[PDB]
Amino acid sequence: GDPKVVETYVELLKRHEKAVKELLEIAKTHAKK
């Protein structure tokens, strides 16, 4: 497929990694809380 599509897809995956890392920081620091 046209790598524009693939690069946008990978960018979505990276956005997802970042959002889940936010979830994790919240989960850890709330467990501490």
Binding site: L13, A19, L23, A31
Partner: protein, 105 residues
């Protein structure tokens, strides 16, 4: 309590969604080992799986420990925030799945 269970259940629904997504990446990648960006996609999705597993276990810890008992507003606002983040995540995943369906078909 009900909110913690509902959110954790949402997390696990999301994890199952991701597992289907990665089975699909497994098929696709297995067809084309030629692409190291498919290697990436696989790796990133697996990282996400590990992190969601860790968060599910962290809230399992928290949930059972809280069951062990009868300040809360901060936890409730954190619940609102985690729910909003989860919403963003599911939106991203559905967009990803649509692109992936375009790409496979």
């Amino acid at each position: 309590l009900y909110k913690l269970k509902t959110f954790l259940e949402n997390l696990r629904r999301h994890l199952d969604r991701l597992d289907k997504h990665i089975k699909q990446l497994r098929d696709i990648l297995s067809e084309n080992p030629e692409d190291e960006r498919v290697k990436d996609a696989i790796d990133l999705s697996e990282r996400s799986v590990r992190i969601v597993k860790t968060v599910i276990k962290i809230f399992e810890d928290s949930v059972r420990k809280k069951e062990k008992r009868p300040d809360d507003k901060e936890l409730d606002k954190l619940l609102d925030t985690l729910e909003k983040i989860l919403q963003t995540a599911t939106k991203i995943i559905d967009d990803a799945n649509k692109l992936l369906e375009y790409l496979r078909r």
